[PDB]
Coordinates of C-alpha atoms and ligand atoms in Angstrom, one line a residue:
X284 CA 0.0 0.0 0.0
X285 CA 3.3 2.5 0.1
X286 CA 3.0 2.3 -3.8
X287 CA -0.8 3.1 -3.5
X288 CA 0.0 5.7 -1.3
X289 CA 2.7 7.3 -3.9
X290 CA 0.3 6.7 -6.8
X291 CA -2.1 9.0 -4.5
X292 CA 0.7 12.0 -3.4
X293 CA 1.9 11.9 -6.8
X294 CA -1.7 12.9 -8.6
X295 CA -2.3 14.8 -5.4
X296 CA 1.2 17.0 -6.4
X297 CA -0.1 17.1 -9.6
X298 CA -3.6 18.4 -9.2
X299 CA -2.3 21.4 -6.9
X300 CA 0.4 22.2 -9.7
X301 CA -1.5 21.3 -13.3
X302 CA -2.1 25.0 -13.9
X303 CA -5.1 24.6 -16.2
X304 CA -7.7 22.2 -15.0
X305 CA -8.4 19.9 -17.6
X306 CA -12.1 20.1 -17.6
X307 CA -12.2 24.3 -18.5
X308 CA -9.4 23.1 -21.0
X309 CA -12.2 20.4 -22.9
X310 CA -15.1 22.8 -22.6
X311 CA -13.5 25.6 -24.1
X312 CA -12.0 23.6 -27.2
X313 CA -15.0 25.3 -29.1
X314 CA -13.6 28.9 -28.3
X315 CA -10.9 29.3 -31.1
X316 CA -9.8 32.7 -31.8
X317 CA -11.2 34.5 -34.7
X318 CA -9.3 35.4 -38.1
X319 CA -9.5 39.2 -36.8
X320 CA -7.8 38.1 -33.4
X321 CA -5.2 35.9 -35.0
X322 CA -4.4 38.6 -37.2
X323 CA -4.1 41.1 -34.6
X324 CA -1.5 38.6 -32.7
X325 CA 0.4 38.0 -35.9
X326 CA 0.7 41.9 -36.1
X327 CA 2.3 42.3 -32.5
X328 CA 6.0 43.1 -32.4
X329 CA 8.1 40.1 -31.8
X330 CA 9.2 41.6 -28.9
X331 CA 5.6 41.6 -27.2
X332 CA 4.9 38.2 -28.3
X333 CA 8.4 37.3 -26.5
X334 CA 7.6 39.2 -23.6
X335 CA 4.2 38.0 -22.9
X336 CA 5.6 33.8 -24.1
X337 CA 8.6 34.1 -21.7
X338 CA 6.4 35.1 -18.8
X339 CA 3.7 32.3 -19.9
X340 CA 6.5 29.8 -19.9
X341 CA 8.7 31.6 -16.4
X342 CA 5.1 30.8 -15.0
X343 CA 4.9 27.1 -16.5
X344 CA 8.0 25.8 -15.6
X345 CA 7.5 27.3 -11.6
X346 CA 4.4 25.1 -11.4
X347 CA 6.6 22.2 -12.4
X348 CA 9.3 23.5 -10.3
X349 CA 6.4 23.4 -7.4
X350 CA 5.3 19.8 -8.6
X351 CA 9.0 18.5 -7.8
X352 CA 8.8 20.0 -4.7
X353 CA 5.8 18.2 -3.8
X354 CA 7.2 14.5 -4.7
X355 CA 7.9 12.0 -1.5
X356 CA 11.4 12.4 -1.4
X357 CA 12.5 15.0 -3.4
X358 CA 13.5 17.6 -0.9
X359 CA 15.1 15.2 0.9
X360 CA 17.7 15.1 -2.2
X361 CA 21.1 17.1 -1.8
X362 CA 20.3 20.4 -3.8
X363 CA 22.4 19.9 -5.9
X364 CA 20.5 17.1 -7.3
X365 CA 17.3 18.9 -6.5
X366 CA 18.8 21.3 -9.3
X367 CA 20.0 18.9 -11.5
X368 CA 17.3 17.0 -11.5
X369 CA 15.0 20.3 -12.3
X370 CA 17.6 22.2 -14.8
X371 CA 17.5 18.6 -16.7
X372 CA 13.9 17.7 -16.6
X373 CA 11.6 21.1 -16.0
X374 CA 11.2 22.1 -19.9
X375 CA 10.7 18.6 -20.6
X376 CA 7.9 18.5 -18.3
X377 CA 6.3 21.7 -19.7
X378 CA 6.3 20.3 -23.3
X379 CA 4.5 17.3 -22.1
X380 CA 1.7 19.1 -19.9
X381 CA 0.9 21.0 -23.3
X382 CA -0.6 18.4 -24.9
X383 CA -3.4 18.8 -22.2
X384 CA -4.2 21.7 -24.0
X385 CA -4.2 20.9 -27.3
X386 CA -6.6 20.1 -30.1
X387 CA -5.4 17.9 -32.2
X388 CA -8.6 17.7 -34.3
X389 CA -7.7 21.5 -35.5
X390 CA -3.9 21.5 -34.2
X391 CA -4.3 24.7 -31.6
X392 CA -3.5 25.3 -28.6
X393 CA -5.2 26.9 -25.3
X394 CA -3.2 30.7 -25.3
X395 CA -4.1 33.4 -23.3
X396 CA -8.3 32.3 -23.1
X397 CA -9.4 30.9 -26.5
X398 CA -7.5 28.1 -29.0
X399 CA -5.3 28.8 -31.8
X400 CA -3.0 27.5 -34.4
X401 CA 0.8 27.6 -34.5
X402 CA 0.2 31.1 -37.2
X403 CA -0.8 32.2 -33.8
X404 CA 3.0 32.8 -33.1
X405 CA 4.1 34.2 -36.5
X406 CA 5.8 37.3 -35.1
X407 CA 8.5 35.4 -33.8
X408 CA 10.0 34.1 -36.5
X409 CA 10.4 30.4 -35.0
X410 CA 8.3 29.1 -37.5
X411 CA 10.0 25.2 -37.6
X412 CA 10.6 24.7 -33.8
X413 CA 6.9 25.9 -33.0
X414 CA 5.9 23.3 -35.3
X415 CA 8.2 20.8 -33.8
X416 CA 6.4 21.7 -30.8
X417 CA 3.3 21.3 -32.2
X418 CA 3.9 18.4 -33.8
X419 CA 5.2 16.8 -30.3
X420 CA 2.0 17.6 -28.7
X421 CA 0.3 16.1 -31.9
X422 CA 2.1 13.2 -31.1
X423 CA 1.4 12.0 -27.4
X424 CA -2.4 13.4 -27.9
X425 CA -2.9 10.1 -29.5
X426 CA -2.3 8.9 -26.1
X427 CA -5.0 10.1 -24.7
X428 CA -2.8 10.6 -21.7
X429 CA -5.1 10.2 -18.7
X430 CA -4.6 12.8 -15.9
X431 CA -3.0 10.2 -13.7
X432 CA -0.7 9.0 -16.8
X433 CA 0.3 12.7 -17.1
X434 CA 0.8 12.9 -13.3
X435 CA 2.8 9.8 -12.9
X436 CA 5.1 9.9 -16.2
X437 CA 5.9 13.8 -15.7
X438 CA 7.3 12.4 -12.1
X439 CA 9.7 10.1 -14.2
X440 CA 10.6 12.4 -16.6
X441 CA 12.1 14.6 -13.5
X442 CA 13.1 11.7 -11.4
X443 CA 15.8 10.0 -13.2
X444 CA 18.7 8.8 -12.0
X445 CA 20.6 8.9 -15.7
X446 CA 20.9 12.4 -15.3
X447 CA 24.9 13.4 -15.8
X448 CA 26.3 15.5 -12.4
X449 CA 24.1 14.0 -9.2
X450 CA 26.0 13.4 -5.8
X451 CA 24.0 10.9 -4.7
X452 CA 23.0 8.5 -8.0
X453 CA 21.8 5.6 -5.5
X454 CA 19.2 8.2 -3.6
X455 CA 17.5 9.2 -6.8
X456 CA 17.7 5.5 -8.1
X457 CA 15.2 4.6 -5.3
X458 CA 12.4 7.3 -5.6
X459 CA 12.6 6.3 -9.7
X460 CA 12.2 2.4 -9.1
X461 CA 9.4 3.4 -6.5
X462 CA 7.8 5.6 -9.3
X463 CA 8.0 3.4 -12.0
X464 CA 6.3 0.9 -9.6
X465 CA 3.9 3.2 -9.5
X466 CA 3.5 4.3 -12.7
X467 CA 3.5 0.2 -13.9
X468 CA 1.3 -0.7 -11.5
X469 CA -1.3 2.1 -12.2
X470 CA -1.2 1.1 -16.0
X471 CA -1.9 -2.9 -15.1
X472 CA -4.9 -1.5 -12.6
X473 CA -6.8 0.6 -15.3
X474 CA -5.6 -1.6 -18.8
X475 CA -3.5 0.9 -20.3
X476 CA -0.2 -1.1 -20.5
X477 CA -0.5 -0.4 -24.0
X478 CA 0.5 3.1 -24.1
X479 CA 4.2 2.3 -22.8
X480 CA 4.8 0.7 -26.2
X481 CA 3.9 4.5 -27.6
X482 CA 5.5 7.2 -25.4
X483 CA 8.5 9.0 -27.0
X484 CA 11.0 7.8 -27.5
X485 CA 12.9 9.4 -24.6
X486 CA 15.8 11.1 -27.1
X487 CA 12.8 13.0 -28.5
X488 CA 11.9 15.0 -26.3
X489 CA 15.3 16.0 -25.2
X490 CA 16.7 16.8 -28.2
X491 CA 13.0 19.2 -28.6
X492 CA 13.2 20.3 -25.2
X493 CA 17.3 21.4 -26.0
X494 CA 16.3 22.9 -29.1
X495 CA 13.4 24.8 -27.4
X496 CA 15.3 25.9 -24.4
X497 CA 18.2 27.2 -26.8
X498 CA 15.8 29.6 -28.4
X499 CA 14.3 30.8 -25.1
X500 CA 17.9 31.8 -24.7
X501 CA 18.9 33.7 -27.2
X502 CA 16.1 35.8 -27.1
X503 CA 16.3 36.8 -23.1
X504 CA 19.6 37.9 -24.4
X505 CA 18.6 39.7 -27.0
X506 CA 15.5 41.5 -25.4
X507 CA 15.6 39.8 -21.6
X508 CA 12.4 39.7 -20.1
X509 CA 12.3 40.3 -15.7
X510 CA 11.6 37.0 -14.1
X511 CA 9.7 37.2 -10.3
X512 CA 12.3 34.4 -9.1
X513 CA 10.8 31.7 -7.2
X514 CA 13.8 29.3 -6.8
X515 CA 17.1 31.0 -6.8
X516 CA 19.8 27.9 -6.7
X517 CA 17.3 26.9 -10.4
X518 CA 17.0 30.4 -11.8
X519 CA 20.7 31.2 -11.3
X520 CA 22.1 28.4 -13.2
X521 CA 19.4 29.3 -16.6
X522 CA 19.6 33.5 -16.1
X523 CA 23.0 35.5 -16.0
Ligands
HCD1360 C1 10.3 29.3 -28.6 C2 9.3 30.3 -27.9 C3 9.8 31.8 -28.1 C4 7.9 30.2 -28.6 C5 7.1 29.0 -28.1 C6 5.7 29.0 -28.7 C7 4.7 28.0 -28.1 C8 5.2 26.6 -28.4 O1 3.5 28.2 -28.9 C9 4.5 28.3 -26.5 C10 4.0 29.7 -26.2 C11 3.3 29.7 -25.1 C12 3.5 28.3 -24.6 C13 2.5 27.7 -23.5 C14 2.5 28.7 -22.2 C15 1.9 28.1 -20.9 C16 1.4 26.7 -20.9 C17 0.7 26.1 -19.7 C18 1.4 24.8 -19.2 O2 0.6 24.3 -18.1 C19 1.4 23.8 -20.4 C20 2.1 24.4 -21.6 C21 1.6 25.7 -22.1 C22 0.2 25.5 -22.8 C23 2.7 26.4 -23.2 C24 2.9 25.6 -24.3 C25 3.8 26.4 -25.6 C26 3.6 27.5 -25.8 C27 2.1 27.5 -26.5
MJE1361 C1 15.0 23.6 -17.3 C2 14.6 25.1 -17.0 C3 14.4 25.9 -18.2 C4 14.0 27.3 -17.7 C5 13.9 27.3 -16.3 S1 14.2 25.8 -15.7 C6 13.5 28.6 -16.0 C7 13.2 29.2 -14.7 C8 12.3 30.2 -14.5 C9 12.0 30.7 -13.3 C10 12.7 30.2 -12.2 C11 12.4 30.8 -10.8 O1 13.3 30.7 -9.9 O2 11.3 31.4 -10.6 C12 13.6 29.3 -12.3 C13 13.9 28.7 -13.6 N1 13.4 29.4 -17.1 N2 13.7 28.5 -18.2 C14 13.7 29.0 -19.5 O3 14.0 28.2 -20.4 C15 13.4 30.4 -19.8 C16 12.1 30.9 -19.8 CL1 10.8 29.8 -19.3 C17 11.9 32.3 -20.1 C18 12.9 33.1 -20.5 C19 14.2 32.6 -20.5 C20 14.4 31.2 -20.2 CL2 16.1 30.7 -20.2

């Protein structure tokens, strides 16, 4: 019953941390923005549509930073590790809770109240890694990722003991096997074994998430945005 019990504290983290409830995110799917709106967001300066991404995405990744924190065992981690473990895994995390929000009958996602394409973003000039993105999310919506399966797999793709530069390998080693316990067991309990066959292919979504990160980069230093810090040993080693 420990394994219950994490199954339990893990969608419990989760729930408190998803951002976007997932029902609001279903209802709304019929409230697409309009050609005028998608215009007037195409017409934005770059610059805008950086500032007002970067602080959508500051936000994004302080929720999963908050969903960590929340995970039996985490904080008892060196913080060291607590940082590798979050400077390695927090985008990837991100780019997985967006396929919640996305349509993959019309390919948009939920932006700032109502759903829209990837010409949404035009302004940017980022044109092939938004679709990449897109395209990811178009991916593992086949899934139909239950909110549980996002819950449980989000905590593996964080805790994972491969990760180059942790101090104590042996200490993240056990909460992984005790979440992909969980995780397995949860799957054999509600018949979706099948989807482990399907999830990416784990190269995928860090080589995306590199790519994506990168790009967030290079523009904070062309045009940085001001971040209300949460975590100060995390944003020290991604701001300078
Ligand atoms: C490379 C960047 C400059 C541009 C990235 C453009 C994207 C891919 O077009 C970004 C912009 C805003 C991003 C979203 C901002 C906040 C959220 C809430 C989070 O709970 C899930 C991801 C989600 C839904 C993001 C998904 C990707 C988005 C939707
Ligand atoms: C793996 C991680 C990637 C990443 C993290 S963590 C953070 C972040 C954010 C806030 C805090 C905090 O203390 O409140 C800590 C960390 N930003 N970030 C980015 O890619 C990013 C963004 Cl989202 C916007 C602009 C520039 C950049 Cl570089």
């Amino acid at each position: 019953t420990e394994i219950e019990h994490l199954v339990q504290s893990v969608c419990k983290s989760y729930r408190e941390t998803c951002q976007l409830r997932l029902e609001d995110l279903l209802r709304q799917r019929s409230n697409i923005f309009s050609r005028e709106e998608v215009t007037g967001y195409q017409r934005k300066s770059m610059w805008e549509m950086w500032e007002r991404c970067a602080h959508h995405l500051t936000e994004a990744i302080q929720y999963v930073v908050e969903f960590a924190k929340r995970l039996s065992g985490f904080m008892e981690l060196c913080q060291n590790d607590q940082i590798v473990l979050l400077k390695a895994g927090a985008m990837e995390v991100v780019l997985v809770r967006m396929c919640r929000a996305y349509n993959a009958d019309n390919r948009t996602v939920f932006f700032e109240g109502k759903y829209g394409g990837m010409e949404l973003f035009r302004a940017l000039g980022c044109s092939e890694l938004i679709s990449s993105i897109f395209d990811f999310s178009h991916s593992l919506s086949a899934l139909h990722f239950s909110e549980d399966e996002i819950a449980l797999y989000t905590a593996l793709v964080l805790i994972n003991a491969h990760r180059p530069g942790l101090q104590e390998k042996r200490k993240v080693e056990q909460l992984q096997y005790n979440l992909e316990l969980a995780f397995h067991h949860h799957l054999h309990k509600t018949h979706r074994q099948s989807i482990l066959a399907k999830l990416p292919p784990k190269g995928k979504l860090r080589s995306l998430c590199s790519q994506h990160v990168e790009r967030l980069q290079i523009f904070q230093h062309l045009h940085p945005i001001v971040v209300q810090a949460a975590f100060p040993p995390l944003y020290k080693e991604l701001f300078s």
